[PDB]
Structures are given as C-alpha cells and as structure tokens.
Amino acid sequence: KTYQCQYCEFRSADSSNLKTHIKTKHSKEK
Ligand SMILES: [Zn+2]
C-alpha cells in the first residue's frame, strides 16, 4: 500500500516525503 496525509488529500508512497510534507504544508511555524 501507500501512505495518506491526515490534513489534505496527499497520498504518497514515501514516508520521508510525507512527514516533511505535513511539516512544510500544515504544521510549519505559527
Ligand atoms: Zn497534506
């Protein structure tokens, strides 16, 4: 299988680029 994002519809078959995704796209610096 693949992985999914729990914010948007970002389902990638990578972890290194899914966790970074979450950080740089949902939980950045606020
Ligand atoms: Zn996302």
Distance 8 CA to ligand 1 centre (A): 4
Which experimental approach was used here?
A: NMR
Distance 14 CA to ligand 1 centre (A): 13
| 15 contacts 1 by C-beta, under 8 angstroms | no
Distance 18 CA to ligand 1 centre (A): 8
| 25 contacts 7 by C-beta, under 8 angstroms | yes
Q: Which residue in 18, 14, 10 sits closest to 1, CA to CA? A: 14
Distance 16 CA to ligand 1 centre (A): 13
Q: Rounded to whole angstroms, how far apart are CA atoms 11 and 17?
A: 10
Domains and their CATH numbers in the chain: 1-30 (3.30.160)
Q: Rounded to whole angstroms, how far apart are CA atoms 2 and 12?
A: 6
